[PDB]
Amino acid sequence: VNIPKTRRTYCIKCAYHTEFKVGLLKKGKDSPRKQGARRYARKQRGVHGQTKPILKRKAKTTKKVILKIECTKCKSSQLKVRGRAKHVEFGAEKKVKGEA
Amino acid sequence: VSSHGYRRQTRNLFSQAFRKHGMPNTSTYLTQYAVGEYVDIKVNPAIHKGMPHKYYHGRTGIIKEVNRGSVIVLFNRILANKTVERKVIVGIEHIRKSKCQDEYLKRLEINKKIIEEAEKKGEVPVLFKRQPKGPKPAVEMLMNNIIELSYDKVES
RNA sequence: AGUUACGGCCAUAUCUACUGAAAAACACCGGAUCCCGUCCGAUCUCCGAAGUUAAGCCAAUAAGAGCCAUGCGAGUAUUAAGGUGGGCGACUACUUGAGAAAGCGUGGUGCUGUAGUUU
RNA sequence: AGGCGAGCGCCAUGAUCAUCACGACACACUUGUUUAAGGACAAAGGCCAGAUGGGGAGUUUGGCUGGGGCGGUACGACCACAGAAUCAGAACGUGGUCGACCGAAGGUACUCACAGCGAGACGAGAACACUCGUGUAGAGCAUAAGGACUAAAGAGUGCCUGAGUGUGAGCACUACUGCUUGCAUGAGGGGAAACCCGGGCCUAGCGAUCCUACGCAUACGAGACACUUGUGGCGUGGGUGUCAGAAAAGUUACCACAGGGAUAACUGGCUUGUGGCCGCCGAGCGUAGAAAGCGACGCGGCUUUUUGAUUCUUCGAUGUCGGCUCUUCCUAGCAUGGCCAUGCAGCCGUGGCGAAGUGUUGGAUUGU
RNA sequence: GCUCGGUCGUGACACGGAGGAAAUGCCAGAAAGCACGGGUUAACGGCGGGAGUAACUAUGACUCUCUUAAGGUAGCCAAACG
RNA sequence: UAGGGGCGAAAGACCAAUCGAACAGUCUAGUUGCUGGUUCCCUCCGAAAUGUCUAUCAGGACAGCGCGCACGCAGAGAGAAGCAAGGUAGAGCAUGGGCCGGUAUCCUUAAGGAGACGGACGAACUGCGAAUGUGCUUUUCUUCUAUGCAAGCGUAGUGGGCGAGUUCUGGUAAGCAGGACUGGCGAAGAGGAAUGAACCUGGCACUGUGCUAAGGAACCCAAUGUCUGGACAGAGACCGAAAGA
RNA sequence: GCAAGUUGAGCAGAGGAAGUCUGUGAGGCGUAGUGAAGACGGAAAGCAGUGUGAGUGCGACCCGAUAGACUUGUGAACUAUA
RNA sequence: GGUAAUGCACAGUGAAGAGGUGGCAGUGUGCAUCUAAGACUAAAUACAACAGGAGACCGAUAGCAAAGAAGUAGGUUGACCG
Ligand SMILES: [Zn+2]
């Protein structure tokens, strides 16, 4: 699947159509200071073994394509969801018809 | 085993009749509908928006609400041994005006005359009910021109 | 009464040969300077009247093909209810009811709405 | 505080604190070398942290199934067939498909067809490019199957990113999911305009609570006030295919317990494919000649003595193969008695009929 | 599997470093192991297929071909192992 | 030398008639979706063995079918009369699949091929199309109806079914395995088929007199005789095929 | 029984007394809802008892495992070995 | 219950004379409230043996195991059992 690097679309904050910059969303790093991390650290602490379950019988191959789009004027962001695909490319050459 | 998609088992239903393929006729689009009319569903397979589920094909119901190019029709259905009302959205290409009230409306037109006179002259209407066909009538016959019948045909 | 513009129901209107047609139309027809579009003024777009009923459109003809109706096929095929009916079965007779199709014969061959024009 | 290369890093040595070997003493510590020998090492204790660890400890080792196991997946989805013409409707019933793919194969406006067949046109042939006439789809429509489509939904050509943003109501047995439809908005798109568009012509391509990542504004914050961290709310992603969602390998012939004829290993019952026995027909063969004796290719039966198929009875128990011993019954007749046919000279036979009274043995190898 | 040698890399806590008002984080550091190179079967164990070819026929000493960590030697056999 | 321990010329042998983990006592009345049992009378009403989800298949929960209390009340497991939808039985072989033979004529060969046509066919072929069954409106439409219906609230049992008639799928079949429709036995006695869960007649408080059903009427055993044809086989009343004199 | 209200909380005063009568006097639920919250606000008789059907937890209708653990409890008079 | 530590310990480290706390981690600053690392204390509260009084309790297969010479007759190698 090929996606262009730019898209003119409606910006909710500006309340009219504007140019946006287009790219794949990126998963950030887990923080030790959140309530879930704190709870788990304390529970693991003693001689208690493994205290929470871990998935082993996994089954899926792909994961869902998700695009982050940024408004060039006001820097606000929107998230667009596009379904499952094994491979993604940004800004490659057009699928020109009637090749040799 | 069978499957359970939205258009399961519709090979015979949802197919055009012989020498009747193509889009609908102008009369379909120029018919005006109103709340409270009785209407009859027959799906046109060539139109892919506003199709009802195939249970409703060939059933008749009553118009509840009217929109730009679609209608909402009320139906009743038995589920788990109880009666349930159902509100079905249909596009105007898949409906025709029902004939089921025709005779009753004629009878009302006759009643509407009598019920006025019944205030002036009588006290109660005669009301013009239908009656089922009675016994066989009496006959007077001239008795010339007799025809005899016989087992002449041997039927080898 | 036809035609023509815009229609309704979508073959009684289709397909193949032939033949007719006052008037007014409808056409074929004559050019590309411009607007517009082509490998190509063939098609599409524009500007025109020297010609012509040869064509189309309209109408007639044909033991024509196809379509539409009706009669017959036929109370035939199949079928609902019933009995301590029959048959080793496969299946089938009877009593009170409902009731076809293909073939084949005979007839048809568009009907109409609103406006405009022509003895 | 010195020196090098167009104040930089690089090369010299001079002051300031830890610090690793090596020596030489004896004071901790060690040893019945004890009025002694070793010596800050050893050996022995303590607190944290990595590695190894069936030596042990706990526990687990899905379901459906013509009994279980091995095999398949009827375990989540989609089309067609059948189920005596609404809808629904079982079996490890039938023919198949799915866990994706695509900036166009998405949205709009306009133009024109196609597969073939009959004539033509140098090289040029069965099969090269160009034309004329016919052409209801005999073609195409990415990917199963069905349905749909003709001045198009197919093939080309132009422009666009609606594969917008808030918030309602409903349909499929309706939670998740998929689709249909209302109102409001965009310094939205395509088209002259009427019209159409919030993915793919329609029916399939998918996933809760808690935790965590990101986007969006509006909240909270402990006696008070400021900031760095944190906690709330809505929406999407990260995943459970056993697909309405536990974190999981074997073996027991040393074996235990609760139950089951809801379910196997005998017999019996129903069935008779397979096993065995009998009829019908007459192509050919028999030295001539269908039929003394045979009888291809086909067709109809009977039996329960073989082995299957099924699970009705028994799992708080019906003692399981063969032999020994002893009795009775059946006939589809091997001998013995009476007869008929003959390819019956006689002798020996072969095919059939009524008949179950009396007979049908001794041994070698082998559990048979 | 056991055993021997070196690090070239990885690999804990402590001990340091930079920054910030401070917490939390970040960076360095890092034995033995692991990786890497050798030894070892009276350690666990393991030890092949296909074609042609000799003056009757058969059989193949001989040839070619695929393959490996090595392709079952000396003996023994329808053996309590066919 | 003592129990997750001993001892063993090794058999999981032996450790007070106990050993593939001793005895005593306690926690403890451990747990059980599994087996057994569960104590007086009469009156009235009366089921289910099906759907969805479940580490679910000998169990649960939700819904469906009972009963009790009942605010209230024009309704109905039947017909007519207008109106819709359907692709089965029959019938056919016009698109698609597909068997055998063709006159004239045509094409070549001097073979064969095509053919104006006839016969034979499909669960996944259709050009036509029933009966029976399904839904809508009308009491302004016959006929019944209070000793009747009944929202709502609370709560039970059930979730192994089996059989007849008519039909269907798998299988050589089966008292075999699995669906659909209308009544049964389950939970149903009485009279009849000699006997039999389900077949025929026909639904049960307690007495008395009459009458009929189904099935019987020489005798067993309450009631029996008549007329007309067939039939001779230790036949038939109870009973098997193709083939035959 | 009382009703926009209601109640035997504990505890005090009286009384030849485990009864009864009287006080003082909390709390709880109700008198109207909406949101996570900041915040806002606009329908519906309740409270306490005496009993019956029914759910959940405790031995939980009655009887019934093979097993698991704990003791500063016992045993080599049978049998094993020094 | 105590949630970026409610209390108690062990090893390293280790104060100030001024310190501790104000149910969410950190740094600063006012405000409120207390004074740890030494000791003693009545009343109102809990419950066997033994004694006394009561009861909608049981009545010799019941009620404590035991209404008489009952933890007895009797039993285990023993602990213990009855
Ligand atoms: Zn913006």
Short mmCIF file of C-alpha atoms (C1' of nucleotides) in Angstrom, two decimals, chain D residues 47-361:
data_model
loop_
_atom_site.label_atom_id
_atom_site.label_comp_id
_atom_site.label_asym_id
_atom_site.label_seq_id
_atom_site.Cartn_x
_atom_site.Cartn_y
_atom_site.Cartn_z
"C1'" C D 47 24.43 -8.00 54.38
"C1'" C D 48 23.32 -7.26 49.15
"C1'" A D 49 23.91 -8.92 43.77
"C1'" G D 50 24.55 -12.02 39.40
"C1'" A D 51 25.36 -17.54 37.39
"C1'" U D 52 24.19 -22.76 37.81
"C1'" G D 53 20.51 -25.99 39.83
"C1'" G D 54 14.63 -32.68 38.19
"C1'" G D 55 19.11 -32.78 44.04
"C1'" G D 56 14.23 -31.46 45.61
"C1'" A D 57 8.96 -28.70 45.96
"C1'" G D 58 4.23 -27.27 44.14
"C1'" U D 59 1.15 -27.69 39.81
"C1'" U D 60 -0.65 -28.48 34.75
"C1'" U D 61 -0.90 -31.61 30.40
"C1'" G D 62 -8.71 -28.17 26.16
"C1'" G D 63 -13.40 -30.00 23.39
"C1'" C D 64 -16.39 -32.54 19.58
"C1'" U D 65 -16.02 -37.98 18.11
"C1'" G D 66 -21.47 -44.24 15.45
"C1'" G D 67 -16.37 -46.33 22.87
"C1'" G D 68 -11.53 -44.32 23.34
"C1'" G D 69 -6.42 -43.53 20.73
"C1'" C D 70 -3.97 -42.22 15.95
"C1'" G D 71 -6.28 -39.08 11.63
"C1'" G D 72 -9.62 -34.80 10.40
"C1'" U D 73 -11.69 -30.05 12.46
"C1'" A D 74 -18.27 -30.56 11.23
"C1'" C D 75 -14.33 -25.17 17.32
"C1'" G D 76 -14.69 -18.11 14.58
"C1'" A D 77 -16.55 -16.27 9.41
"C1'" C D 78 -18.71 -16.50 3.66
"C1'" C D 79 -21.52 -18.43 -1.27
"C1'" A D 80 -24.16 -22.62 -3.61
"C1'" C D 81 -27.22 -27.76 -3.22
"C1'" A D 82 -30.84 -30.68 -0.26
"C1'" G D 83 -34.29 -30.68 3.63
"C1'" A D 84 -42.19 -32.62 -0.14
"C1'" A D 85 -42.87 -23.69 -3.86
"C1'" U D 86 -42.90 -17.87 2.90
"C1'" C D 87 -38.90 -17.80 6.86
"C1'" A D 88 -36.42 -21.24 9.70
"C1'" G D 89 -34.61 -26.50 9.90
"C1'" A D 90 -30.01 -31.85 11.93
"C1'" A D 91 -25.52 -35.82 10.46
"C1'" C D 92 -17.24 -36.57 10.82
"C1'" G D 93 -23.99 -34.86 4.48
"C1'" U D 94 -22.22 -32.46 -0.93
"C1'" G D 95 -19.01 -28.49 -4.24
"C1'" G D 96 -15.76 -24.82 -2.60
"C1'" U D 97 -13.51 -20.20 -0.20
"C1'" C D 98 -11.35 -16.71 4.28
"C1'" G D 99 -7.28 -14.47 8.34
"C1'" A D 100 -5.82 -10.44 2.72
"C1'" C D 101 -5.01 -6.94 -1.41
"C1'" C D 102 -5.26 -1.67 -3.82
"C1'" G D 103 -3.27 6.51 -4.02
"C1'" A D 104 -6.17 3.56 -7.19
"C1'" A D 105 -8.70 -1.67 -8.09
"C1'" G D 106 -11.38 5.05 -3.83
"C1'" G D 107 -15.03 9.86 -5.36
"C1'" U D 108 -17.25 12.45 -9.57
"C1'" A D 109 -18.04 14.07 -15.09
"C1'" C D 110 -17.91 12.78 -20.03
"C1'" U D 111 -16.66 9.42 -24.47
"C1'" C D 112 -17.05 4.63 -26.60
"C1'" A D 113 -18.04 -0.78 -26.48
"C1'" C D 114 -16.74 -6.13 -26.22
"C1'" A D 115 -15.91 -12.05 -27.44
"C1'" G D 116 -16.48 -13.89 -32.35
"C1'" C D 117 -17.84 -14.69 -37.64
"C1'" G D 118 -17.85 -13.27 -43.21
"C1'" A D 119 -15.10 -10.16 -47.20
"C1'" G D 120 -10.30 -7.16 -48.12
"C1'" A D 121 -4.94 -5.06 -47.67
"C1'" C D 122 3.96 -7.10 -49.52
"C1'" G D 123 7.13 -8.91 -47.22
"C1'" A D 124 3.69 -12.01 -43.72
"C1'" G D 125 3.01 -18.15 -42.63
"C1'" A D 126 -2.22 -21.40 -38.34
"C1'" A D 127 -0.94 -16.85 -35.47
"C1'" C D 128 1.86 -9.12 -36.54
"C1'" A D 129 -0.75 -3.87 -37.92
"C1'" C D 130 -4.98 -1.48 -40.54
"C1'" U D 131 -10.28 -1.44 -42.50
"C1'" C D 132 -15.83 -2.56 -43.86
"C1'" G D 133 -20.38 -5.21 -42.40
"C1'" U D 134 -23.07 -8.09 -38.69
"C1'" G D 135 -22.87 -8.91 -33.46
"C1'" U D 136 -28.60 -9.28 -26.21
"C1'" A D 137 -23.19 -10.28 -24.17
"C1'" G D 138 -21.52 -15.84 -26.66
"C1'" A D 139 -16.72 -10.60 -23.15
"C1'" G D 140 -15.15 -8.10 -19.04
"C1'" C D 141 -16.07 -6.72 -13.85
"C1'" A D 142 -8.02 -7.94 -9.15
"C1'" U D 143 -9.41 -12.26 -5.25
"C1'" A D 144 -14.62 -18.41 -3.75
"C1'" A D 145 -19.63 -19.03 -5.31
"C1'" G D 146 -24.22 -16.74 -6.42
"C1'" G D 147 -26.79 -12.29 -7.86
"C1'" A D 148 -26.29 -7.43 -10.68
"C1'" C D 149 -24.80 -4.28 -14.89
"C1'" U D 150 -25.12 -2.09 -22.19
"C1'" A D 151 -25.53 5.76 -25.02
"C1'" A D 152 -22.98 1.16 -18.18
"C1'" A D 153 -21.30 -0.54 -13.02
"C1'" G D 154 -17.23 -2.86 -18.65
"C1'" A D 155 -12.69 0.00 -21.72
"C1'" G D 156 -10.42 4.79 -22.03
"C1'" U D 157 -9.73 10.24 -20.67
"C1'" G D 158 -10.02 14.79 -17.29
"C1'" C D 159 -10.08 16.80 -12.24
"C1'" C D 160 -10.24 15.64 -6.65
"C1'" U D 161 -8.61 13.37 -1.77
"C1'" G D 162 -15.65 12.61 1.18
"C1'" A D 163 -10.88 6.72 2.62
"C1'" G D 164 -14.61 15.22 5.89
"C1'" U D 165 -16.16 17.09 11.14
"C1'" G D 166 -20.14 17.08 15.40
"C1'" U D 167 -24.45 14.54 17.21
"C1'" G D 168 -29.34 11.09 16.68
"C1'" A D 169 -32.50 6.73 15.10
"C1'" G D 170 -32.82 1.71 13.42
"C1'" C D 171 -32.14 -3.75 10.55
"C1'" A D 172 -29.77 -8.89 10.59
"C1'" C D 173 -32.69 -14.48 16.55
"C1'" U D 174 -28.30 -8.61 17.88
"C1'" A D 175 -23.77 -7.99 22.90
"C1'" C D 176 -19.09 -7.31 19.76
"C1'" U D 177 -19.18 -6.44 14.59
"C1'" G D 178 -21.30 -5.01 9.65
"C1'" C D 179 -24.64 -2.19 6.98
"C1'" U D 180 -29.05 1.37 6.20
"C1'" U D 181 -30.87 6.16 7.26
"C1'" G D 182 -31.93 11.89 10.18
"C1'" C D 183 -30.31 16.98 11.40
"C1'" A D 184 -26.38 20.52 11.69
"C1'" U D 185 -21.93 22.54 9.94
"C1'" G D 186 -16.77 23.07 6.32
"C1'" A D 187 -12.10 30.53 3.48
"C1'" G D 188 -15.52 20.81 0.87
"C1'" G D 189 -14.97 17.92 -4.03
"C1'" G D 190 -16.65 16.66 -9.20
"C1'" G D 191 -20.31 18.52 -12.86
"C1'" A D 192 -23.40 23.88 -17.27
"C1'" A D 193 -26.82 22.13 -13.96
"C1'" A D 194 -30.49 18.87 -11.82
"C1'" C D 195 -27.86 15.26 -9.01
"C1'" C D 196 -23.95 12.26 -6.31
"C1'" C D 197 -19.83 11.35 -2.53
"C1'" G D 198 -18.58 10.43 5.49
"C1'" G D 199 -13.93 3.73 1.03
"C1'" G D 200 -13.91 -0.63 -2.49
"C1'" C D 201 -21.20 -2.98 -7.51
"C1'" C D 202 -23.96 -6.31 -3.35
"C1'" U D 203 -23.57 -10.66 0.10
"C1'" A D 204 -16.78 -12.54 3.78
"C1'" G D 205 -11.42 -10.54 5.42
"C1'" C D 206 -12.35 -10.22 12.23
"C1'" G D 207 -11.84 -9.40 19.16
"C1'" A D 208 -14.45 -7.63 26.11
"C1'" U D 209 -12.89 -6.02 31.80
"C1'" C D 210 -8.05 -4.63 34.02
"C1'" C D 211 -2.96 -2.71 32.48
"C1'" U D 212 -0.18 0.27 28.80
"C1'" A D 213 0.87 3.91 24.43
"C1'" C D 214 -1.02 8.17 21.54
"C1'" G D 215 -4.68 12.26 20.21
"C1'" C D 216 -8.63 15.68 22.32
"C1'" A D 217 -10.39 19.51 26.05
"C1'" U D 218 -13.21 20.32 30.81
"C1'" A D 219 -12.11 18.15 35.77
"C1'" C D 220 -9.02 16.69 40.68
"C1'" G D 221 -5.01 17.58 43.88
"C1'" A D 222 -5.56 16.26 51.15
"C1'" G D 223 -3.96 23.38 56.60
"C1'" A D 224 -2.25 27.48 52.61
"C1'" C D 225 0.37 29.05 48.16
"C1'" A D 226 4.01 28.23 43.51
"C1'" C D 227 6.14 24.70 40.20
"C1'" U D 228 8.19 19.22 38.55
"C1'" U D 229 5.84 14.36 38.86
"C1'" G D 230 0.84 12.04 39.46
"C1'" U D 231 -4.85 10.85 39.35
"C1'" G D 232 -9.87 11.57 36.46
"C1'" G D 233 -13.10 11.87 31.48
"C1'" C D 234 -14.03 10.66 25.82
"C1'" G D 235 -11.95 8.21 21.47
"C1'" U D 236 -8.57 5.12 18.90
"C1'" G D 237 -4.15 1.52 18.69
"C1'" G D 238 -0.95 -2.92 21.36
"C1'" G D 239 -4.72 -9.48 21.93
"C1'" U D 240 -6.65 -13.45 23.44
"C1'" G D 241 -7.69 -18.54 15.85
"C1'" U D 242 -9.88 -23.43 22.09
"C1'" C D 243 -11.95 -16.89 17.95
"C1'" A D 244 -18.80 -14.27 24.19
"C1'" G D 245 -11.42 -14.23 25.60
"C1'" A D 246 -7.07 -19.54 32.21
"C1'" A D 247 -0.47 -18.33 32.19
"C1'" A D 248 0.85 -25.01 31.20
"C1'" A D 249 4.91 -31.66 28.96
"C1'" G D 250 4.90 -37.14 29.55
"C1'" U D 251 4.36 -42.08 31.73
"C1'" U D 252 2.17 -46.24 35.23
"C1'" A D 253 2.13 -53.99 33.48
"C1'" C D 254 3.39 -51.17 41.12
"C1'" C D 255 -1.28 -48.62 41.37
"C1'" A D 256 -5.84 -46.05 44.44
"C1'" C D 257 -11.09 -43.57 44.73
"C1'" A D 258 -16.28 -41.88 42.94
"C1'" G D 259 -19.45 -43.51 39.30
"C1'" G D 260 -21.16 -45.48 34.23
"C1'" G D 261 -24.57 -50.86 30.67
"C1'" A D 262 -25.47 -42.65 28.91
"C1'" U D 263 -19.71 -46.54 26.35
"C1'" A D 264 -15.76 -51.07 24.40
"C1'" A D 265 -13.68 -56.59 24.98
"C1'" C D 266 -18.47 -62.73 25.22
"C1'" U D 267 -23.51 -64.63 24.05
"C1'" G D 268 -28.38 -63.41 22.37
"C1'" G D 269 -31.70 -60.01 19.11
"C1'" C D 270 -32.20 -57.08 14.10
"C1'" U D 271 -29.40 -56.93 9.08
"C1'" U D 272 -26.88 -60.19 5.26
"C1'" G D 273 -22.50 -56.58 2.15
"C1'" U D 274 -18.84 -60.76 2.57
"C1'" G D 275 -19.09 -66.41 3.26
"C1'" G D 276 -21.96 -70.72 1.79
"C1'" C D 277 -25.94 -73.36 -0.84
"C1'" C D 278 -30.08 -73.38 -4.87
"C1'" G D 279 -32.94 -71.84 -9.15
"C1'" C D 280 -34.20 -69.19 -14.32
"C1'" C D 281 -32.28 -68.20 -19.60
"C1'" G D 282 -29.45 -70.71 -23.72
"C1'" A D 283 -24.03 -68.15 -26.61
"C1'" G D 284 -20.82 -71.85 -27.32
"C1'" C D 285 -18.46 -77.14 -26.07
"C1'" G D 286 -19.06 -82.17 -26.17
"C1'" U D 287 -16.49 -87.69 -32.40
"C1'" A D 288 -22.96 -85.98 -34.70
"C1'" G D 289 -26.00 -82.79 -31.89
"C1'" A D 290 -28.12 -76.35 -27.48
"C1'" A D 291 -29.86 -79.44 -23.02
"C1'" A D 292 -25.86 -87.79 -21.36
"C1'" G D 293 -22.70 -84.37 -19.03
"C1'" C D 294 -21.53 -78.97 -19.31
"C1'" G D 295 -23.37 -73.82 -19.54
"C1'" A D 296 -20.05 -67.80 -20.81
"C1'" C D 297 -22.83 -62.77 -20.65
"C1'" G D 298 -26.80 -61.51 -17.46
"C1'" C D 299 -31.17 -62.08 -13.70
"C1'" G D 300 -34.12 -63.87 -9.06
"C1'" G D 301 -33.86 -66.29 -4.11
"C1'" C D 302 -32.75 -68.92 0.58
"C1'" U D 303 -29.37 -69.88 5.09
"C1'" U D 304 -27.08 -68.03 9.71
"C1'" U D 305 -22.56 -72.70 10.17
"C1'" U D 306 -17.65 -67.09 8.23
"C1'" U D 307 -16.40 -62.21 8.98
"C1'" G D 308 -18.39 -57.37 9.04
"C1'" A D 309 -22.15 -53.42 10.37
"C1'" U D 310 -25.07 -51.33 14.73
"C1'" U D 311 -25.15 -50.60 20.62
"C1'" C D 312 -31.32 -52.98 22.63
"C1'" U D 313 -30.10 -56.19 27.68
"C1'" U D 314 -25.80 -57.15 31.79
"C1'" C D 315 -19.96 -52.85 34.61
"C1'" G D 316 -23.10 -53.34 44.15
"C1'" A D 317 -19.27 -59.38 38.24
"C1'" U D 318 -23.69 -64.18 33.64
"C1'" G D 319 -15.80 -67.43 34.98
"C1'" U D 320 -12.85 -66.20 28.83
"C1'" C D 321 -9.48 -70.64 23.74
"C1'" G D 322 -8.63 -75.80 22.84
"C1'" G D 323 -8.86 -80.90 24.46
"C1'" C D 324 -11.06 -85.05 27.58
"C1'" U D 325 -15.99 -87.32 29.00
"C1'" C D 326 -21.40 -87.95 27.67
"C1'" U D 327 -26.25 -87.26 25.51
"C1'" U D 328 -29.72 -85.56 22.04
"C1'" C D 329 -31.24 -83.05 17.40
"C1'" C D 330 -30.91 -81.10 11.90
"C1'" U D 331 -30.16 -82.58 6.32
"C1'" A D 332 -28.10 -79.42 2.05
"C1'" G D 333 -27.29 -88.08 1.82
"C1'" C D 334 -20.16 -89.90 2.42
"C1'" A D 335 -21.29 -95.71 3.20
"C1'" U D 336 -25.29 -99.32 3.80
"C1'" G D 337 -31.38 -100.48 1.22
"C1'" G D 338 -35.17 -99.57 -2.99
"C1'" C D 339 -35.43 -97.05 -7.86
"C1'" C D 340 -34.99 -93.48 -12.76
"C1'" A D 341 -31.48 -91.52 -16.81
"C1'" U D 342 -26.85 -92.40 -19.41
"C1'" G D 343 -21.77 -90.71 -24.27
"C1'" C D 344 -25.56 -97.82 -19.40
"C1'" A D 345 -21.87 -104.44 -23.46
"C1'" G D 346 -19.64 -106.55 -18.85
"C1'" C D 347 -16.45 -104.60 -14.62
"C1'" C D 348 -15.75 -99.57 -12.60
"C1'" G D 349 -18.60 -95.01 -12.82
"C1'" U D 350 -21.61 -90.17 -13.56
"C1'" G D 351 -26.26 -87.02 -13.03
"C1'" G D 352 -31.18 -87.32 -10.24
"C1'" C D 353 -35.75 -89.30 -6.62
"C1'" G D 354 -38.49 -91.24 -1.57
"C1'" A D 355 -35.48 -91.94 2.77
"C1'" A D 356 -31.93 -89.52 8.93
"C1'" G D 357 -32.81 -96.71 11.10
"C1'" U D 358 -27.48 -98.23 11.88
"C1'" G D 359 -22.28 -96.47 10.93
"C1'" U D 360 -18.33 -92.79 9.95
"C1'" U D 361 -11.58 -95.22 13.05
#
